[PDB]
Design a protein around this ligand. Structure first.
Ligand code: S2O
Ligand code: S2O
Ligand code: S2O
Ligand code: S2O
Ligand code: ZN
Length: 257
């Protein structure tokens, strides 16, 4: 029953998910001047060449592109991570207008959208067991700004008409998530949480410094999706982002000088 509206949005989540007021919540504002370069971070490795995308699903909050995670086909390692983290899905958060939409902010700047590539630590065997661990997940976050079109996003854009409403899915095989990355893998990292209920504090966040550029037309198509199911009153799927949460006793580390 949670959502993003006045009556079920982020200010209400704590009543059913009390960890919403926890010590390690996400997203956060990334104060770039306070974030410190960390020489102990190892090189980050995004290894997506063998990824197997399967399906795209409108879940009533966002849309998820799902992957086969039954083997180490698309993994994230290095950087702040101990071991191997396997890609399970990606999704986005976006705004009703280009001036808002991201979850993380950079010196208070909100981007038009934010991509989350979600991975689980293979030492825990399955995603469900990983979300019972303080180092169970790694989410690679990538900001979207509006400018030139992102070619590797267009296949996603053009399938959205077929998953307009909650509960709809479509085949989405042979999609290469490498087409959603920027050139640089410079990043900030900190320990946090899922940004939607159940808000579990399991995530090592890795937020890339370089945004990707997408066209106005691409993001406008995100905004034509619906939160509601077929046959129900239409509510545009926009502003599906949680605002920045208190940093508490955390430090954000930078991979770059
Ligand atoms: N705490 S919550 O966001 O899951 C929630 C908000 C609001 C309602 C009642 C309105 O549908 C129920 C649950
Ligand atoms: N809809 S989803 O992205 O939460 C999801 C993706 C992939 C799987 C399969 C995991 O073995 C399950 C759920
Ligand atoms: N970091 S900044 O000063 O470019 C900036 C601050 C505040 C905002 C408003 C929210 O996006 C945008 C940019
Ligand atoms: N937005 S997020 O990447 O923190 C996130 C990833 C995964 C889940 C689990 C349900 O899909 C919830 C939130
Ligand atoms: Zn997310």
């Amino acid at each position: 029953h949670w959502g993003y509206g006045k009556h079920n949005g982020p200010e209400h989540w704590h009543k059913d998910f009390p960890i919403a007021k926890g010590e390690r919540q996400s997203p956060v504002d990334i104060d770039t001047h306070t974030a410190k370069y960390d020489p102990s971070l190892k090189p980050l490795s995004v290894s997506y060449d063998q990824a197997t995308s399967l399906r795209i699903l409108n879940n009533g909050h966002a849309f998820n592109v799902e992957f086969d995670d039954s083997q180490d086909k698309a993994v994230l390692k290095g950087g702040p991570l101990d071991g191997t983290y396997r890609l399970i899905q990606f999704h986005f958060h976006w705004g009703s207008l280009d001036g808002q939409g991201s979850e993380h902010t950079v010196d208070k700047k909100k981007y038009a959208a934010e991509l989350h590539l979600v991975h689980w630590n293979t030492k825990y065997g399955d995603f469900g067991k990983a979300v019972q661990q303080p180092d169970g997940l790694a989410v690679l976050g990538i900001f979207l700004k509006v400018g030139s079109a992102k070619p590797g996003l267009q296949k996603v854009v053009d399938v959205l008409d077929s998953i307009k409403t909650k509960g709809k899915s479509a085949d989405f095989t042979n999609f290469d998530p490498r087409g959603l990355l920027p050139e640089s893998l410079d990043y900030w990292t900190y320990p946090g949480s899922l940004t939607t209920p159940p808000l579990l504090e399991c995530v090592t966040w890795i937020v890339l410094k370089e945004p990707i550029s997408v066209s106005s037309e691409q993001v406008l198509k995100f905004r034509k999706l619906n939160f509601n199911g077929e046959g129900e009153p239409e509510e545009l799927m926009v502003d599906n982002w949680r605002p920045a949460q208190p940093l508490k006793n955390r430090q954000i580390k930078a991979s770059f000088k």
